[PDB]
Amino acid sequence: GSKKPVPIIACNRRTGKCQRA
């Protein structure tokens, strides 16, 4: 608990939906 990083997510070619596994 120090900094506020950001993971990676996968986008989808459908109903505005994007997220990681």
Side-chain angles (χ1 to χ4, degrees):
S2 272
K3 314 300 184 91
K4 47 183 93 285
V6 178
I8 59 86
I9 75 97
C11 239
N12 190 43
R13 286 94 81 73
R14 304 294 245 291
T15 174
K17 130 170 265 71
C18 297
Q19 92 210 122
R20 80 215 130 81

